[PDB]
A paper describes a structure:
Gain of function mutations in RET are implicated in several human cancers, e.g. medullary thyroid cancer (MTC) and lung adenocarcinoma (LAD). The identification of these mutations and rearrangements in RET which lead to constitutive activation, together with convincing preclinical data validating RET as a classical oncogene, make this kinase an attractive target for cancer therapy. Our initial focus was to identify novel, low molecular weight, ATP-competitive inhibitors of the RET kinase domain with improved selectivity for RET against KDR in cellular assays, relative to 1.
Of the first swathe of approximately 30 simple anilinoquinazolines prepared, the most interesting observation was that phenol 6 resulted in a significant gain in affinity towards RET. Initial modelling of 6, subsequently confirmed by the determination of the X-ray structure bound to RET, highlighted a pair of hydrogen bonds from the phenol to the side-chain of Glu775 (the conserved glutamate located on the αC-helix) and the backbone NH of Asp892 (from the conserved DFG motif). Comparison of the X-ray structures of 6 and 1 reveals that the ligands share very similar binding modes. The anilino ring of 6 binds between the gatekeeper Val804 and the catalytic lysine Lys758 and, in comparison to 1, shows a small rotation towards Asp892, with minor re-orientation of neighbouring side-chains consistent with the formation of hydrogen-bonding interactions between the phenol and Glu775/Asp892. This is a consequence of KDR X-ray structures displaying a conformation in which the αC-helix is displaced away from the ATP binding site in comparison to RET. The associated movement of the conserved glutamate located on the αC-helix (equivalent to Glu775 in RET) would likely compromise the formation of the pair of hydrogen bonds to the phenol observed crystallographically in RET.
Author numbering:
A (entry chain A), B (entry chain A): 700 to 711, 714 to 822, 843 to 1010
The structure:
């Protein structure tokens, strides 16, 4: 089938191959049902003398076709992208052993866990900080969209925070190239969370840069609420009727009107009525001036 | 889309509806990336006076289309099956609140966790016990197959152990009816673990009762090793080449020849060269005589 072709084809880019003997794996940083990200250290990694701390993504022993395909897909995409706010691939291990992805280590972990820790007990997160984060992410999406690449899974859990509070879009296992037709379409049910998908993605299984914009709107919401849960208290299965009747999330207690207006814009029913990521950056910049 | 139709159609069988006010939810018994099973207690459940202890399956807040569809699918199947070795549905809550599935509580939990606990520190599991378990499960599959229902996810983690060590096949979210064409076919990548799928399911995405037989073979293996990991040390992505070149798992240190021969039979390349569940029961019965 399609996956076995990809697996066999993978066997036959030496630039990205790292020797397993140079890699030492540490504690788990995060897990899922079929795969996990682990802390690791790499000896003589790409012209860097000595050991370099890194993150490593792998499957679990009981991984499925879907999870395997996602890993192969994430590697394939990451080889093509270089941007300050997109996570950086170093290489992979696939010869004699489990497939491992090696990326630059992100100091503070996911943006969601970072924001939620921030609301407890060196410096407190200001509004200007939150706007800075959104803008950094907006810039990265402006880069991806300009390559006609759709992420399909924008969410605070899928953004990483590195040294000096720099945003890193991660988790590219579901992203697709849409150069030809400008849309990606999945016939079966996605493995993307209901509460983050756009109305046309949820109902029609249609994914575009403009649907990425919708997800960025929910991401704006997570940020402003310091890691809140979208549509709080509402069951995911109710989103169909709720969105189809024109309902949207309400303004968070700690959210400016200017920011909420942007959220609502990202959530327009007509996908072309939504702003593009270039507009979002421009909007966010005006907010800090 | 297909899911939204199912969601709307669900709104409009009163026999299975339980009042949420009669249900108290307890601790988590098991979790996944998009859903969990919880311990619960039900007041006046189906003609049973007072409180009844039960298990409840629900989604998590960030559930996806796939996970929602699986829950709706599991409920729909469970309404149709009644068997001593198939888990028993009591009802569901879907009005004003999150969808919840209510089933009979299983004392010792999953068969995998039960077998693994058994290999530590009232009575020890004998060989006769393990053969008894396989036979109980074989009987349940003989019931499902006779209804032309394919489980698609036979595994020790998906079997439950109730009072008096009685086996209960669970997790029917992926099972499909195959009355018409005798085969179910998935165009996209399954969410079933690689190491449990049959050679034609893994490569060709083809699922039948005979592929259920293949999975029962791996299940036989888990049991005999008291919850061992299939193809130990071998990366899932290597299963394609390994199975296509005719390799199979070797005989476990604590496994009789008679039992291993059955495993090998379940693992024949030609699906019709495999035994049917009626033969497996007969084989297992001869083993205890
Ligand atoms: C400090 O915590 C973390 C640090 C991380 N640093 C880098 N990558 C990660 N994840 C990653 C790596 C490769 C691919 C991919 O999609 C995601 C990390 C995850 C962490 O925690 C979960
Ligand atoms: C004592 O532990 C457990 C007891 C359980 N008892 C019943 N059902 C369960 N699971 C269930 C319920 C409904 C549908 C379905 O597919 C699975 C259980 C799970 C447990 O642990 C995970």
């Amino acid at each position: 089938g399609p996956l076995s072709l990809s697996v066999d084809a993978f066997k036959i880019d030496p630039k990205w191959e790292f020797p397993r003997k140079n890699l030492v794996l540490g504690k788990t940083l995060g897990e899922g049902e079929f795969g996990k990200v682990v802390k690791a250290t790499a000896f003589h990694l790409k012209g860097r003398a000595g050991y370099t701390t890194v993150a490593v993504k792998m499957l679990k022993e009981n991984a499925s076709p879907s999870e395997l395909r996602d890993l192969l897909s994430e590697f394939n995409v990451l080889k093509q992208v270089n941007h300050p706010h997109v996570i950086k691939l170093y290489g992979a291990c696939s010869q004699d052993g489990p497939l491992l992805l090696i990326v630059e280590y992100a100091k503070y972990g996911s943006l969601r866990g970072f924001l939620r820790e921030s609301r407890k007990v060196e410096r407190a997160l200001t509004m200007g900080d939150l706007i800075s984060f959104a803008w950094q992410i907006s810039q990265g999406m402006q880069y991806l969209a300009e390559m006609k690449l759709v992420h399909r899974d924008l969410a605070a859990r899928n953004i990483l925070v590195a040294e000096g509070r720099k945003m890193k879009i991660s988790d590219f296992g579901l992203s697709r190239d849409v150069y030809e037709e400008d849309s990606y379409v999945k016939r079966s049910q996605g493995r993307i969370p209901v509460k983050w998908m756009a109305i046309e993605s949820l109902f029609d299984h249609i994914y575009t840069t403009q649907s990425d914009v919708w997800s960025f709107g929910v991401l704006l919401w997570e940020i402003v609420t310091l890691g809140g849960n979208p549509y709080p208290g509402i069951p995911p299965e109710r989103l169909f009727n709720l969105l189809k009747t024109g309902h949207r999330m309400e303004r968070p207690d700690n959210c400016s009107e200017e920011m909420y207006r942007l959220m609502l814009q990202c959530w327009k029913q007509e996908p072309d009525k939504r702003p593009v990521f270039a507009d979002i950056s421009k909007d966010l910049e005006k907010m800090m001036v």
